């Protein structure tokens, strides 16, 4: 029954057995409560990028094996700009860093500077949007610094995701402006459609998203009792168990309730919510409830021979504990899945609160270490100057003193603090310049 | 200009011209004219074994790594049906027979027989559906002799395809009822629930479909022009090219028809139709003709001054060489629409003709060979005795005398002749039993 470490407690081992109890993993094989959720991004995902007007494909590191085919098909400015994805399998934690892993990575050229970037935000929104209205997980949208840049690009923007149980940072998704150095490396290049003396460099972008995303949401969402599904990944919505069946019950009102159970699951169907019933009797109802829960189906119906009489059925819900009475009429496919979009929003103000929370704005560097060590994120001025993200990393690792206890920039955040930063000191111990801007800093994964 | 062999002709470098051309493969990489087709066939066939109730999943032969851990998480008949797919990448003639490919197989685990071969057929349903309905490819549904099964199953069934230019079979798709063989190699099994004395083991199934789908599309559609893509797999459905445009334009009236072509192209797209246009100048129209018609683009939309002004579209359809002239108006979306479908309904209806042509119902050996000549499959009485399919591809080989020459079974089809089987002689030379069935030869790829 249950789980068998608490999450504040032992967090390995909580994640462990949940990932093993809800059935998402096989020691990895992807089992289905966890591969649909990753089929729920690729259909999401992967309409929002063909509407951009990205085109998928599919190659037999990327770069090395794509660029070279880029120069050969870049004949002319006319045969920009090229746009392709590909859905692949790349060669421990499960879902979080593993040897083996799927993902999505696309790959673009453009003509102009301005195209080239406005494609690496609009990428960015899109993987801020699988996080947050999918997964129901928040992020923070940012640049990342020079040292922690994808290193054959000019600049890395990036989804930064909060693990409070741990207290670290884990980076979501990237999108790169690779600028020109590509072109540079593999010959891309065509002539000024302006000026035939002339030979210009495509811009160009690269962009990835991978089963990382189903970690995450597992790390944020799960609590105590087992897995929390957002329910817009959720390959069963609503469980419906029978209940109330005892030694007296009649045949004919045991198959009544049976069948109820069936009509009802029908019935969602037919309205678009993802019903199922559990009518294993040989276990209890309770284990059954157990069952369910540990996965995280996001709704759980209880039909039993009150709830059949009354018209109206007994809804537990998964996240909150909450019980509900819902009608049991022509309104109750709409009415679930109504509740089934509270579920995710609550999801995601609770997720999202727990995240503001814990993002600490420090200006003391003596405040620092202790902050990490509350398990938070830190928000802090900074000038600007590499050597002083090293610094931080380097003293923050000094003074915590087998994950690493070192701070490292996250992100330079896209919203930043209304605070201006320049009213301060650069953070690092000892330092003196005024700050240019805020950054977020943690532990990370 | 067009394509450098005919397929009646030279099929081969037919092939590989336009697959090259029509800008499908890079010498494969799969480019985005023949990617967009398996996406198609993904959310398409995905959908439909989705509704089915098979569920995705992700392994790192698939019998030898997947069936361990069907014994594994079969415990009870609690556990069934266990139905899984994956849609992934297995290691010549491109997309017909190359080294890697990408497919989709499915392997089920069901408690009763019945469900198992019912599901089977549901599956080539799904396949038929496949080649029909999408890329509009005619197919013959039937069952493999027991010579031509798959080996570890009972019994596999088949959607059969024809390559008219060179007279030869195709295999689609097949499903196969795999009965208890593979459970009792991996030792798959529950107790019988209404009898705890007793182990029964499940019965499964496999299927698989590959982008060898994309291959026999080209081989059937494609004509001494190139590419004629079907509409529904179509990335691009309509190309605009303007036309007229000459020494004496205006700029007032070069800007006009420019503007009108985006103008077109935005309302199609908003009434669903994938349209976009090509507005290289530095190429003639007929230049951009060529190569619109090389890929197989369903409609081209001359739009030129007096399009413009008459507010009339002409629409040339690629598969016919039809030209139509089609109001340019509120309805223009709905009514380009409309012709796509008719476009489908006409390639389908065309090639289902050709097909239906080419079966030959022989019942006298003499005949059999010469049939075969003329590149036709045939439609023979058989016995059913392996012996009699065996002499059938022995005597044909012998006497046709690098390809293949013997004559193989493709399949009993489910729709048999009227023509009673029984009232012929097996169609081996010198055969004397009653045949028993009708059944579909020929040389095949
Ligand atoms: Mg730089
Ligand atoms: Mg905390
Ligand atoms: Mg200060
Ligand atoms: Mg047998
Ligand atoms: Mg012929
Ligand atoms: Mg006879
Ligand atoms: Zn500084
Ligand atoms: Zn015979």
Redesign the interface.
Known sequence: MGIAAKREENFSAWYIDVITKAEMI?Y?????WA??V??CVQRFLGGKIEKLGV??????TSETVMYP?YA??IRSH?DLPVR?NMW??VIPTPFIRTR?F?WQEGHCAWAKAEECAKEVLEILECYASVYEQLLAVPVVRGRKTEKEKFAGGDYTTTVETFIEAVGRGCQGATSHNLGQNFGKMFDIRFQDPENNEQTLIPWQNSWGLSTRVIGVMIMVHGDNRGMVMPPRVA?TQVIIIPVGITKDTTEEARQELLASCWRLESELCEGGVRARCDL?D?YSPGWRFNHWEVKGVPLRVELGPRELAERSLAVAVRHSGARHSVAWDAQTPAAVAALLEDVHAQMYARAKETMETHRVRVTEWTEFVPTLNRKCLILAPWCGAMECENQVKKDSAEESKAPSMGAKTLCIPFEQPEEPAEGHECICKGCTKPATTWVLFGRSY
Chains 1, 2 share one sequence.
Request: proline letters at 7%; glycine letters at 0%.
């Open positions: 096989e990895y094989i992807i089992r289905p591969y649909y990753w089929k085109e998928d494909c599919y190659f037999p085919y050969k098909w006319r392709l692949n399998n083996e799927l390959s294993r040989n």
